[PDB]
Amino acid sequence: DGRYSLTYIYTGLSKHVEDVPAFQALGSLNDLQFFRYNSKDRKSQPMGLWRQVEGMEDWKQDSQLQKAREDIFMETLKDIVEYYKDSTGSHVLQGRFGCEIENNRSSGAFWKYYYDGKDYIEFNKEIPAWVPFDPAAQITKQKWEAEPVYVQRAKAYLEEECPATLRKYLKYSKNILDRQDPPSVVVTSHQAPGEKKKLKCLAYDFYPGKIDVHWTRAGEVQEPELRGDVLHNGNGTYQSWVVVAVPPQDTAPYSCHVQHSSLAQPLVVPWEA
Ligand SMILES: *[C@@H]1O[C@H](CO)[C@@H](O[C@@H]2O[C@H](CO)[C@@H](O)[C@H](O)[C@H]2NC(C)=O)[C@H](O)[C@H]1NC(C)=O
Ligand SMILES: *[C@@H]1O[C@H](CO)[C@@H](O)[C@H](O)[C@H]1NC(C)=O
């Protein structure tokens, strides 16, 4: 087994402009986002390849869960703006929490909130208690610790419940996170009216994203003019290209070389003028 992480990020706005939900929530497994929720449609929705995964989460219910998280999230934001006597301004509260395992061994945990970009409050499951970094965080901590049970629950979420969810989610996400999809390539050349000729070598439809794409000119690894790449969450595939400029009076043979963890040995693709 290898590394796997579960992360959730909450964003709440005290005074939201039109067409922007006051509260957004999202979740990513490793390098891919699998769900999303906002205060407009108020419905948890799977994403990417998880749109086709059946029986991993009863989203209809999770929507009710989110609606609960949301009400506590904005209230917290309400109290902060309240404290600072400035409800006329536009403020923001970001929270981040999740956990990670490695070799089926819980190896991480985090739960931190940010206010207007500054560190606000974060939980330390070792004490266990919340650490306040902002004067108003002091009240929040007070409220979130009014009963001896509260900090026991939080520790319980990071050390027991969250990793439980990661493991569950992992049983249904094998055919996704563990993929090793080989990269397909296409070497194309475009000539602009005036400049030199340019050769584009694209590597598409692959996963993981760590790839090695480069050109050569008669065996000599050439320096790229343009380099780029992207992630398409819908498919859960990466794309990575490279471009080189070729002198007007050159005949030498250009070959694109692609390396990957999915490939047994590197691929080569020459450009036939
Ligand atoms: C992942 O999504 C991308 C874009 O939605 C797919 O790539 C498109 O492929 C079509 C036909 O192959 C092209 O006409 C588009 O220009 C491509 N979009 C872009 C901007 O890359 C890709 O095929 C999807 N992955 C798979 C294998 O389904
Ligand atoms: C770790 O994986 C094993 C199977 O390899 C599974 O039975 C177990 O529930 C997982 N976590 C543990 C040790 O509780």
Distance CA 41, CA 143 (A): 30
What residues form DSSP beta bridges with 102? 3
* Distance (Å) from CA 185 to ligand 1 centroid: 13
Alpha-carbon torsion 19, 22, 23, 24, what sign? positive
**Cβ(234) – ligand 1 distance below 6 Å:** yes
What residues form DSSP beta bridges with 192? none
**Cβ(205) – ligand 1 distance below 6 Å:** yes
Indicate the domain borders of the chain: 2-179, 180-269
Q: CB-hemisphere CA count at 13 Å for 99? A: 24
Nearby residues of 190 by Cβ (< 8 Å), 6 or more positions away:
197, 198, 200
Peptide bond into 128 cis (omega under 30): yes
Q: Resolution in A for the shown PDB structure?
A: 3.1
| Closest C-alpha among 87, 115, 123, 98 to residue 25 | 98
Q: According to the 3-state scheme, what is the secondary structure of the chain?
A: CCEEEEEEEEEEECCCCCCCCCEEEEEEECCEEEEEEECCCCCCEECHHHHCCCCCCCHHHHHHHHHHHHHHHHHHHHHHHHHCCCCCCCCEEEEEEEEEEECCCEEEEEEEEEECCEEEEEEECCCCEEEECCCCHHHHHHHCCCCHHHHHHHHHHHHHHHHHHHHHHHHHCHHHHCCCECCEEEEEEEECCCCCEEEEEEEEEEECCCCEEEEEECCEECCCCEEEEEEECCCCEEEEEEEEEECCCCCCCEEEEEECCCCCCCEEEECCC
Does 180-269 match 2-179 at the fold level?
Answer: no
Are the beta carbons of 244 and 199 closer than 8 angstroms? yes
Nearby residues of 135 by Cβ (< 8 Å), 6 or more positions away:
83
Q: What are the angstrom distances between the C-alpha of 27 and each of 46, 60, 104?
A: 9, 16, 20
**Cβ(44) – ligand 1 distance below 6 Å:** no
What residue's CA is closest to ligand 1, atom 19? 232
Identify the experimental approach: X-ray
What residues form DSSP beta bridges with 77? none
* Distance (Å) from CA 59 to ligand 1 centroid: 28
Residue 171 has phi, psi (to 5 degrees) of -65, -30
Are the beta carbons of 205 and 183 closer than 8 angstroms? yes
**Cβ(184) – ligand 1 distance below 6 Å:** no
* Distance (Å) from CA 249 to ligand 2 centroid: 63
Rg, the chain, Cα only = 24
Q: Give Cα 235 distance to the centre of its chain.
A: 14
- The CATH homologous superfamily for domain 2-179 is MHC class I-like antigen recognition-like (3.30.500.10)
Atom of ligand 1 nearest to the CA of 205: 27
- The CATH homologous superfamily for domain 180-269 is Immunoglobulins (2.60.40.10)
* Distance (Å) from CA 151 to ligand 2 centroid: 26
